[PDB]
Design an enzyme around this catalytic site. Structure first.
Site, short mmCIF file in Angstrom:
data_model
loop_
_atom_site.label_atom_id
_atom_site.label_comp_id
_atom_site.label_asym_id
_atom_site.label_seq_id
_atom_site.Cartn_x
_atom_site.Cartn_y
_atom_site.Cartn_z
N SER A 20 0.85 -1.10 0.04
CA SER A 20 -0.27 -0.05 -0.02
C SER A 20 0.93 1.41 -0.07
O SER A 20 0.49 2.21 -0.67
CB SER A 20 -0.91 0.03 1.24
OG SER A 20 -1.42 -1.20 1.41
N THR A 23 7.38 0.14 -2.48
CA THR A 23 7.71 -1.02 -3.14
C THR A 23 9.33 -1.39 -2.73
O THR A 23 9.98 -0.69 -2.51
CB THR A 23 7.61 -0.76 -4.79
OG1 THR A 23 6.37 -0.09 -5.06
CG2 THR A 23 7.69 -2.16 -5.49
N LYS A 36 13.95 0.19 -1.28
CA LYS A 36 12.57 0.27 -1.05
C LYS A 36 12.25 1.82 -1.27
O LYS A 36 12.81 2.66 -0.73
CB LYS A 36 12.16 0.21 0.53
CG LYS A 36 10.94 0.45 1.10
CD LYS A 36 11.12 0.01 2.36
CE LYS A 36 9.86 0.68 3.24
NZ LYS A 36 9.75 0.28 4.77
N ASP A 129 6.27 -3.37 15.74
CA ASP A 129 5.46 -4.02 14.60
C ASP A 129 6.54 -5.51 14.57
O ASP A 129 6.69 -5.90 13.29
CB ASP A 129 5.40 -3.55 13.54
CG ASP A 129 4.63 -4.54 12.40
OD1 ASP A 129 3.42 -5.20 12.93
OD2 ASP A 129 4.59 -4.34 11.40
#
Ligand SMILES: CNC(=O)c1cc(Oc2ccc(NC(=O)Nc3ccc(Cl)c(C(F)(F)F)c3)cc2)ccn1
Ligand SMILES: CNC(=O)c1cc(Oc2ccc(NC(=O)Nc3ccc(Cl)c(C(F)(F)F)c3)cc2)ccn1
Ligand SMILES: [Cl-]
Lengths: 264, 264
Positions: A20, A23, A36, A129
């Site tokens: 989302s 990339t 990235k 996370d």
């Protein structure tokens, strides 16, 4: 110092993943690397902000257990360059290709992740996370912690969220203990080879129940050969009460201890 | 940023090596690390200078093929902290425990060293003492370039010195090409499994002869299975004439090329 990479130097190659927000391609820059980039030609006032955050956090890390940050590139399109890890994430090994590691290997993967987290926390950095999907087994030997997520910046890794986080405390529910909880869920995966609440097909229910204390990982699924010191270290990290959870310095020692008296 | 490590955090352990200028111990700081300290309680106006140089160079590096710099410590006694490499140096493997690597492995070790040097040069850094003894094979897989020397700041690794360096050109004979030459001598070791001029027992003679062009590595000792592209890439790096030697960007491509067409 200066970690900006002059444009025209990086050689973006095959695409590895699209999300989302951003990339990830396998590139070339003094050997194999990973790039990235946002891909969104329009640097959102918030996107450029996140970029500065990620980079500002990665340049503060230098540890064999933390993904190596090579440099960033504000030039034609924002991008972050990190070493290229060969292998698969712990998540992939455990629940996708179902790899059967040895108890010594599992305990070792736990020690390395712990070592990595202990480092991040010492640098006053909260992952927020940490999950098997962000634990990479480079060369099937040596853990590399990082944030391989592309969905976030809606999405959410509910299985690794501590109760106080699943609920909602004043602004920042996150803390060193919240990371320890996620680490607790990682130990659960290493020891059971499965994801939590596999017998419940309703996200909203898991969210609600875990937040109220009604639901908790089923520890009776740990492998038979799983040391008691481990199964205990796990239960301590998953404590529903934030404050009752140990910090990594202690978690590390606990692991390294049961590690010594294991080979036999 | 800041990389200074607060005193009392590092846990110096077993001694690994002692030199004319500095010692190296295996320590503890968020996992196994390596500590290198002067040991000389009296920071020489030149010693403190070198310290700043080494640290200033290491903090400029972030590459899987370059020894990882963890941080420094000016606190009670100067010291440099780097990741702890498990294994032995390429020198040790080749001439001490005489390890027999496969041609694919040798070529791989060459590619990685080249990748590392290519990186250092891109950061405008000249090694000046690249040799098999400074090429570490982390876990017998993954090259780590660095400066494991302690003798210097008298002694000298002549076998890897380019002719212009062995002689005595103006002040600084060192250059990207001088490093390429040393790299050429490393390829010689990987391909022959031996050190140059093994049949000459006189340092002064080797020094003199190599400096005048009279002596040069005997390339007819390369292993029979050694690809032609390699044996050629070697001869190009060892060119007696500084300017005729290629730079690492080209050396890397040359290796990676012959690498692709090798397995079969
Ligand atoms: C074949 N295998 C590959 O797919 C592969 C892909 C890669 O892609 C990636 C490229 C960049 C990143 N960016 C993060 O890592 N950022 C980060 C953010 C916050 C925080 Cl707190 C941290 C932290 F925790 F490290 F400090 C790290 C992640 C993955 C890299 C290597 N290999
Ligand atoms: C089990 N085997 C161990 O003995 C072991 C020992 C260690 O000890 C060491 C501790 C510190 C260093 N310091 C350098 O390396 N500094 C350096 C200087 C200039 C330049 Cl130009 C560079 C360069 F080239 F990298 F950029 C690097 C080297 C080795 C580390 C890991 N393992
Ligand atoms: Cl840095």
């Amino acid at each position: 110092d200066d970690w900006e990479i002059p444009d025209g130097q990086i050689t973006v190659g095959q695409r590895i993943g699209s999300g989302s927000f951003g990339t990830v391609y396998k590139g070339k820059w003094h050997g194999d690397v990973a790039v990235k980039m946002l891909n969104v030609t329009a640097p959102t006032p918030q996107q450029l902000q996140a970029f500065k955050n990620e980079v500002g956090v990665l340049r503060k890390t230098r540890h064999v257990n933390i993904l190596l940050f090579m440099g960033y590139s504000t030039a034609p399109q924002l991008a972050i360059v990190t070493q290229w890890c060969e292998g698969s994430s712990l998540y992939h090994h455990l629940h996708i290709i179902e790899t059967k590691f040895e108890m010594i290997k599992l305990i070792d993967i736990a020690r390395q992740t712990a070592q990595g987290m202990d480092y991040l926390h010492a640098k006053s950095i909260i992952h927020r996370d940490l999950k098997s999907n962000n634990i990479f087994l480079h060369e099937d030997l040596t853990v590399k912690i990082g944030d391989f997520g592309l969905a976030t910046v809606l999405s959410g890794s509910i299985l690794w969220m501590a109760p106080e986080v699943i609920r909602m405390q004043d602004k920042n529910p996150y803390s060193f203990q919240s990371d320890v909880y996620a680490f607790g869920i990682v130990l659960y995966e290493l020891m059971t080879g499965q994801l939590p609440y596999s017998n419940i097909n309703n996200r909203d229910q898991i969210i609600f129940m875990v937040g109220r204390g009604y639901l908790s990982p089923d520890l009776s699924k740990v492998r038979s050969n799983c040391p008691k010191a481990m199964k205990r270290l796990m239960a301590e990290c998953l404590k529903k009460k934030r404050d009752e959870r140990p910090l990594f310095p202690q978690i590390l020692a606990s692991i390294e201890l049961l590690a010594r008296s294991l080979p036999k």
